Design a protein around this ligand. Structure first.
Ligand code: HEM
Ligand SMILES: CCCCc1nc(Cl)c(CO)n1Cc1ccc(-c2ccccc2-c2nn[nH]n2)cc1
Ligand SMILES: CCCCc1nc(Cl)c(CO)n1Cc1ccc(-c2ccccc2-c2nn[nH]n2)cc1
Ligand SMILES: CCCCc1nc(Cl)c(CO)n1Cc1ccc(-c2ccccc2-c2nn[nH]n2)cc1
Ligand SMILES: [K+]
Length: 463
């Protein structure tokens, strides 16, 4: 059989029992009734929900391959999103993923490392923060530019100037699509309808935005072709063309110009917003707990001092910082239900039959907020990642990037941006709150499957 669930209604399945507002709260409530594995219907569509470390680890990790499909909804084809990495399945995905993992290796693309692209961005970021002359600031935009720029430098081999028009509207489009894609109407409700697209105009703005981005990418591709150096690949495009001019005899190939721009658009989509929000929420949390910021600053001072840029080598020497960054990710739980999975064939799971192509919802929340692994899991507290001797304490339960065969492609990259951007910020600034710390609220604003910090302002005071 399928795993037990609330018994559906005919046709609207379980829809009107789900708290649409905070899905992860609802999934957790359900697990109190039906335990760690359970089924929900979203309009005939069966969705098995995994809750808790044990359930998640066995699916994602022990049954890795079987749990490796991307769950597909109406929106997947309504915004043409199954032709890059994030929303691909089968051979197309295996190939572009394995390729993309190779290229995004630290030395994956020539003599400039990923570290060096990030280090550069950290200096520019510190610079822009100086330019605000310690005056009150919504860091939203500035923090957003840094991750967007890292993506640009990884793909086109250039960073941009933060005022370069080509950069601003590239971010605008991305920012537009992101905000749209986070509407519950779009993310959810328009998915209760298999056939009729109920937001034509919206899907249109979505795709028009993609086209702008896709066309800009093509310009850079034509430029990369004319200036090709086979022995000197320098970014993601160079690598991709070389994989092409090499698959030329395996026609037709998973690697085409079209799969390139789609992969690029994927990386811009997956690479900016979540990193950007993670930084924005890190600063919020740092303001709220200035003792925490104080300790990071001690670590920076003692390990890196005020001369050079920080660098990834430093992290092994800065367990307290490391614990902070982890604890930020853990606490804010930005993707409460990851992205959706599908099984790749039919399988028995503990005690059930799950049919090839059935949608799987992983509850990351249940893992990040395990109250035995992380006592008081709703308090922000970097001690969740420290031993009683104050060394870094790894946790199997650290899954803000998911786990298994679909684990975030930017795990190592995001981990480097957060460390370098955070340590550079605090090396060069103290953070002044407007309101008093005691009043400021840091609890996540949840909208469906989306988690976001409260609006806030602060000042970046030089040292
Ligand atoms: C804090 C920053 C980030 C977090 C917390 C994060 C988290 C996630 C999560 C939860 C997934 C879905 C995994 C699943 O399907 O089970 C995901 C997928 C992905 N992330 Fe990230 N991500 C971040 C940043 C990045 C960046 C910087 C890149 C740039 C390469 C990136 C590229 C991707 C890609 C390509 C996927 C899709 C993986 C696949 O389906 O094969 N992400 N990320
Ligand atoms: C018809 C083709 C036009 C596509 C389009 N490109 C851009 Cl750009 C605009 C700006 O609104 N638009 C139009 C657009 C119109 C309404 C929406 C919209 C906003 C809020 C709630 C529902 C809708 C919607 N989308 N489709 N029908 N109603 C979104 C985009
Ligand atoms: C100018 C283009 C802006 C980015 C964007 N707009 C569209 Cl539409 C696509 C296709 O999904 N994309 C690419 C896209 C790829 C992956 C995601 C994704 C990656 C990891 C975690 C969540 C997200 C997600 N998907 N939907 N909203 N946010 C977001 C956007
Ligand atoms: C085809 C792409 C899948 C996206 C999607 N469309 C609908 Cl509808 C569903 C609901 O099951 N879902 C599942 C879903 C889960 C998370 C997100 C998301 C987007 C941006 C930032 C965080 C999240 C997130 N991940 N887990 N919970 N919320 C979006 C959709
Ligand atoms: K319309």
């Amino acid at each position: 059989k399928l795993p037990p669930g609330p018994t559906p209604l005919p046709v609207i399945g379980n829809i009107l029992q789900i708290g649409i507002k905070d899905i992860s709260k609802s999934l957790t409530n359900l697990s109190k009734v039906y335990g760690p594995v359970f089924t929900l219907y979203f309009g005939l569509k069966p969705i098995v929900v995994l809750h808790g470390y044990e359930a998640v680890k066995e699916a994602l990790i022990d049954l890795g391959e079987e749990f490796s499909g991307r769950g597909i909804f109406p929106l997947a084809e309504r915004a043409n999103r199954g032709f890059g990495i994030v929303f691909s399945n089968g051979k197309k995905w295996k190939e572009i993923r394995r390729f993309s993992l190779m290229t995004l290796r630290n030395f994956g693309m020539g003599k400039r490392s990923i570290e060096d692209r990030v280090q550069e961005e950290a200096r520019c970021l510190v610079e822009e923060l100086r330019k605000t002359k310690a005056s009150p600031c919504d860091p939203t935009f500035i923090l957003g530019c840094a991750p967007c720029n890292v993506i640009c430098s990884i793909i086109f081999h250039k960073r941009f100037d933060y005022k370069d028009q080509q950069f601003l509207n590239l971010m605008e489009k991305l920012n537009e699509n992101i905000k749209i894609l986070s509407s519950p109407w779009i993310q959810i409700c328009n998915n209760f309808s298999p056939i009729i697209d109920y937001f034509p105009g919206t899907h249109n703005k979505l795709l028009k935005n993609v086209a702008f981005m896709k066309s800009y990418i093509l310009e850079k591709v034509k430029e990369h072709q004319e200036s090709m150096d086979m022995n000197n690949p320098q970014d993601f495009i160079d690598c991709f063309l070389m994989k092409m001019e090499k698959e030329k005899h395996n026609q037709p190939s998973e690697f085409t110009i079209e799969s390139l721009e789609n992969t690029a658009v994927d990386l811009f989509g997956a690479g900016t917003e979540t990193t950007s929000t993670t930084l924005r929420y890190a600063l919020l949390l740092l303001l709220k707990h200035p003792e925490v910021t104080a300790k990071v600053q001690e670590e920076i001072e003692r390990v890196i001092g005020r001369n050079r840029s920080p660098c990834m080598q430093d992290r092994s020497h800065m367990p307290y910082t490391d614990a902070v960054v982890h604890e930020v990710q853990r606490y804010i739980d930005l993707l409460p239900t990851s992205l959706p999975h599908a099984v790749t064939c039919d399988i028995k799971f503990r005690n059930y039959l799950i049919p090839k192509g059935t949608t799987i919802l992983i509850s990351l929340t249940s893992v990040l907020h395990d109250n035995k692994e992380f006592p008081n899991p709703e308090m922000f507290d970097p001690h969740h990642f420290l031993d009683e001797g104050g060394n870094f304490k790894k946790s199997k339960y650290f899954m803000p990037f998911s786990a298994g065969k679909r684990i975030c492609v930017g795990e190592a990259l995001a981990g480097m941006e957060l460390f370098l951007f955070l340590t550079s910020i605090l090396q060069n600034f103290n953070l002044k709150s407007l309101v008093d710390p005691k009043n400021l609220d840091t609890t996540p604003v949840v909208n469906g499957f989306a988690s976001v910090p409260p609006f806030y302002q602060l000042c970046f005071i030089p040292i």
